[PDB]
RNA sequence: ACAUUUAACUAAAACCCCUACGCAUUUAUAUAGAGGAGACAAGUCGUAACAUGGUAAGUGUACUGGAAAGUGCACUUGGACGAACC
């Protein structure tokens, strides 16, 4: 069954470390879909204010 | 509500009421639902305060606004006015 994957930047500390790290994780799953030849369909994508990700949703 | 009797050549016998409490009063627990306060985050919106915080802040009171808060009158310094003259 297909997976609707969602990543959210947890509110645990100051700065954009949580939001910046979310972008890296989201790119990791997107690249992992290509490695497994999986179709990666973007559903939601809300970038942060410092080149990061607040929350993102995608379908694999 | 309720009666002084019997007996008395030594002296004794007899004596025995019925009405209250209604889930009425008093104090708590449990709550359909409606809110508050503290803790917490960093999410969302703005930047009110702390420097003359960029409208100096605040008190009382009134009205208004998503939200801090905004404005009127009076008061306070828990602000300043640069401290000879020019
Ligand atoms: K908040
Ligand atoms: K003010
Ligand atoms: K002040
Ligand atoms: Mg209740
Ligand atoms: Mg301000
Ligand atoms: Mg001024
Ligand atoms: Mg201003
Ligand atoms: Mg001000
Ligand atoms: Mg005032
Ligand atoms: Mg007031
Ligand atoms: Mg006004
Ligand atoms: Mg006016």
Curated annotation (Swiss-Prot):
Subcellular compartments: Mitochondrion
Transmembrane segments: none
Signal peptide: none
PTM annotation: Methylation of glutamine in the GGQ triplet by HEMK1 is conserved from bacteria to mammals.
Known role: Mitochondrial peptide chain release factor that directs the termination of translation in response to the peptide chain non-canonical stop codons AGG and AGA. Non-canonical termination codons AGG and AGA are found at the end of MT-CO1/COX1 and MT-ND6/ND6 open reading frames, respectively.
Family per similarity comment: Belongs to the prokaryotic/mitochondrial release factor family.
Domain notes: The GGQ domain interacts with the peptidyltransferase center (PTC) of the large ribosomal subunit to trigger nascent chain hydrolysis.
Protein name as catalogued: Peptide chain release factor 1, mitochondrial
Species in which this protein is naturally found: Homo sapiens
Gene encoding the protein: MTRF1
